[PDB]
Amino acid sequence: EYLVSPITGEKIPASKMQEHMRIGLLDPRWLEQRDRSIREKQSDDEVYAPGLDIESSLKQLAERRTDIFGVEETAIGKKIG
Amino acid sequence: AKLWDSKMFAEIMMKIEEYISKQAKASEVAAPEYRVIVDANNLTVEIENELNIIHKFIRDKYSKRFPELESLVPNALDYIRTVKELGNSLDKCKNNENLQQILTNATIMVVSVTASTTQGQQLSEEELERLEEACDMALELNASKHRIYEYVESRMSFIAPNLSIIIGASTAAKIMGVAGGLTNLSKMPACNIMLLGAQRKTLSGFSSTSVLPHTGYIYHSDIVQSLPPDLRRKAARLVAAKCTLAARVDSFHESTEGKVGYELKDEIERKFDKWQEPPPVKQVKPLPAPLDGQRKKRGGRRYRKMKERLGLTEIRKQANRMSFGEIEEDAYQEDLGFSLGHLGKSGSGRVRQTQVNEATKARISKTLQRTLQKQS
Amino acid sequence: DVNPKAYPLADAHLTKKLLDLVQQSCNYKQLRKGANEATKTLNRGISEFIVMAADAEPLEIILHLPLLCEDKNVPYVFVRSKQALGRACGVSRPVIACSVTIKEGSQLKQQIQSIQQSIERLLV
Amino acid sequence: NVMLESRFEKMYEKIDLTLLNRLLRLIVDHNIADYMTAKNNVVINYKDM
Numbered sequence A: 001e002y003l004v005s006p007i008t009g010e011k012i013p014a015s016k017m018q019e020h021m022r023i024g025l026l027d028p029r030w031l032e033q034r035d036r037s038i039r040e041k042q043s044d045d046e047v048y049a050p051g052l053d054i055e056s057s058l059k060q061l062a063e064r065r066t067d068i069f070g071v072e073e074t075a076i077g078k079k080i081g
Numbered sequence B: 001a002k003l004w005d006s007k008m009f010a011e012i013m014m015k016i017e018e019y020i021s022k023q024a025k026a027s028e029v030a031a032p033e034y035r036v037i038v039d040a041n042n043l044t045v046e047i048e049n050e051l052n053i054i055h056k057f058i059r060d061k062y063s064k065r066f067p068e069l070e071s072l073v074p075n076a077l078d079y080i081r082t083v084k085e086l087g088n089s090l091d092k093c094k095n096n097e098n099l100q101q102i103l104t105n106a107t108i109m110v111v112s113v114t115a116s117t118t119q120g121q122q123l124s125e126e127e128l129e130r131l132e133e134a135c136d137m138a139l140e141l142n143a144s145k146h147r148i149y150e151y152v153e154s155r156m157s158f159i160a161p162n163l164s165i166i167i168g169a170s171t172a173a174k175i176m177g178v179a180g181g182l183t184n185l186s187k188m189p190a191c192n193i194m195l196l197g198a199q200r201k202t203l204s205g206f207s208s209t210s211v212l213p214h215t216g217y218i219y220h221s222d223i224v225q226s227l228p229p230d231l232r233r234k235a236a237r238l239v240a241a242k243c244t245l246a247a248r249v250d251s252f253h254e255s256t257e258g259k260v261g262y263e264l265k266d267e268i269e270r271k272f273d274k275w276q277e278p279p280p281v282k283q284v285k286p287l288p289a290p291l292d293g294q295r296k297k298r299g300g301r302r303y304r305k306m307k308e309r310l311g312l313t314e315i316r317k318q319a320n321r322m323s324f325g326e327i328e329e330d331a332y333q334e335d336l337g338f339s340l341g342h343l344g345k346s347g348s349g350r351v352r353q354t355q356v357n358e359a360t361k362a363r364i365s366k367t368l369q370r371t372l373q374k375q376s
Numbered sequence C: 001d002v003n004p005k006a007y008p009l010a011d012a013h014l015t016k017k018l019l020d021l022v023q024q025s026c027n028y029k030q031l032r033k034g035a036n037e038a039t040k041t042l043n044r045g046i047s048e049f050i051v052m053a054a055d056a057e058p059l060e061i062i063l064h065l066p067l068l069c070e071d072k073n074v075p076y077v078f079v080r081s082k083q084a085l086g087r088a089c090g091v092s093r094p095v096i097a098c099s100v101t102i103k104e105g106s107q108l109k110q111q112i113q114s115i116q117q118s119i120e121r122l123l124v
Numbered sequence D: 001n002v003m004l005e006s007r008f009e010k011m012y013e014k015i016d017l018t019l020l021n022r023l024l025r026l027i028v029d030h031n032i033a034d035y036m037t038a039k040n041n042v043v044i045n046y047k048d049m
Helices: A014-024 A029-042 A051-064 B003-028 B033-062 B076-086 B106-115 B125-156 B161-179 B182-186 B190-194 B230-252 B261-273 B301-310 B316-318 B368-375 C013-028 C037-043 C062-071 C082-088 C111-119 D017-024 D030-039
Strands: A002-004 A012-014 C032-035 C046-051 C077-080 C096-103
Touching: A002 A014, A002 B261, A012 A014, A012 C013, A014 C082, B003 B033, B003 B125, B003 C013, B003 C062, B033 B076, B033 B125, B076 B125, B106 D017, B161 B182, B161 B261, B161 B316, B182 B230, B190 B230, B230 B261, B368 D017, C013 C077, C013 C096, C013 C111, C032 C037, C037 C046, C037 C062, C046 C062, C046 C082, C062 C077, C062 C082, C077 C082, D017 D030
Parallel strands: C046 C077
Antiparallel strands: A002 A012, C032 C096, C046 C096
C-alpha cells in the first residue's frame, strides 16, 4: 500500500499519507520562530519575588500588623504584641 | 364526507394495533416483535397525518369565530387545546384558566389582546358541536400517539440500541416517530435530523434569538441541554451528527451490544470536555522599551499612498490658519471655539474655494466590505 | 482485505479513473463531499453517481447510500481508500462518500457517462 | 384649582416588549413594529459583562 509522494516523488505507506504531507510542507519559518520563542522565554529575569520570599514578606507584615493578624493588637507599626 | 368517514377506520385500526401492542408488552414482560414495532411506527405517521388534517379542519371551522388565533398559536396541539378552552365565548374568564398550561404567558396576553378586537361573529350550535367533537377526536389521537411513543420508548434497547445510548430512549422515540421510521431516519442527512421536531414558534415582540429557532428534539435532549447556552448549538450539531451515524448503524442491526453507541457517546463527551476546558496560561506582553536609534523605512508606492492620505491637505492647511484681529462669528452652538479658520473667510488670500481632496475620502475595511458583500 | 459488504469495489484502473473524474468535478464545481451531502443530492435527484470508500469504520454509516442509489436509479461504486478519495475531492481530511452533481452543458458529461457505464457493469 | 406635576417613574425600564409590539401594530405595519420591538431585545455588553 505505497502511494507516490506528490512533493518528493518517493513512496510512503498509506498509513502515513497525512502526517507525511503535513510534515513535508512544514515551513522552516516555524522552526526559526520556535527557536526565537525558546530564546525569549528562557532569558527574561523574573519580576516577582519567589514563593518562599513572598511567605517571609507576609510573615514580616503579619508581625508588624497587629490590627489585622495576631491575638493582641498593638499600634500599626509596632511589633511587640 | 371523507375525513370524517376515514376517521372511524383510522380509529378502528389504531385500536386493533394498540391492542396488539398491549399484548406484545404483556408478553415481553410467528409474529415477531420487530413487525409490531414497524406497525406502531407506521401508526405514528398515520396518526400525525390524521391529526394535521383534523387541525386544518378545526382551523378552517374556527376561523369564522376568531380568525387570528391561528397566527398567534402555530402549534397544532396548542391550537386545538386553545380553541377547546375558549370555545365560542372568547371573554369567558378562560384567560386565567388552563391556558397557562397550554400557552406561554406572553402569548396568552397576546391572544387575549387580539380577542379583545376579534371582529368575528359567533358560531352556530352545530358548528360548536362539530368543533368539540373534532377537538375530542384530536385529543384522543394525541393520547394514542403518546401511548405508542411510550411503548416504542420501552423497546428502544432492541430496535436502536446504539442510538439509545447517545440521546436516551425518550428522545430516540421522538425522533424515530417524527422521522417516520428507523429506515427513514437513516436515509436522512444529519442537518435535517437536528431540525427534527423543531417548531416555528411565534416571536411576540422579541428577537428571533430569544425564541430559539431551528432547534429540535436533539437541542432539548438531556446531554445537549446540560451545556452552557453559548455552546448548545455546536453541541446540538455534534450530537445530531453522531445520532445520524448511530441510526445508520442501527438500521442495519449492527453493533447490537452498543459498542458503536458507546464509542460515539465517549467521543461526544470528550468534545464537550474540550469545549469546557479552561483557557491556557497566556503570557503578558511587556511594554516595548523606548528607543531613540534611527530606523530606516522603505519608500515606494505604498509609502506614497500613505503620505498622500495622512499628509496635510489644503483644506486642512487653510483651516489651521486663524486671522489676527479678525473676530469671526460663532458657527456652531454645540461646540464653541470651533472655527473654520481661513476657510471661506476674508484674508485667506484665495479667491476660489479649495476643492475636496479625494484621497481623504472615507472607505470601509476589506473584511467589512466582505461582510457587506455576503449580506447582499 | 476489504469489507465484503462493499461488493461493487473498483479495481486499480477504475479507482484511478474515478479519482481523476472526482478531481475534475471538484475543479468544475460539480462535486459534493460527505455522506450527508451525498444523501441530499440523492434525495434531490441531482447526482450522476456516488463514490464511497471501503475503509469507513463502521461501513454501515454509508451502507444506506446504495439503497438510496437503487431507489433513485443512480450508479454507485466503492473505492478502497478513504484518504485518497478525500484527496481527490480536494480536502486533506478523509472523505467516505462523494457525489458528482448534474450540471447541464458541462464538459465532463462524456466522462461522467463513461464512468457510469463502467460502474453499472461492474457490480456483478 | 390645583397644579399637578409628576413623572412616570421607571417609564422606560417597565415597557413590556409584547404589549409595546401589539400596540405598535395599531399605528405601523406589523413588519416595522416587529423590527422595532425585536431591536430592544438585544444583548447588552460592557467590558466583560
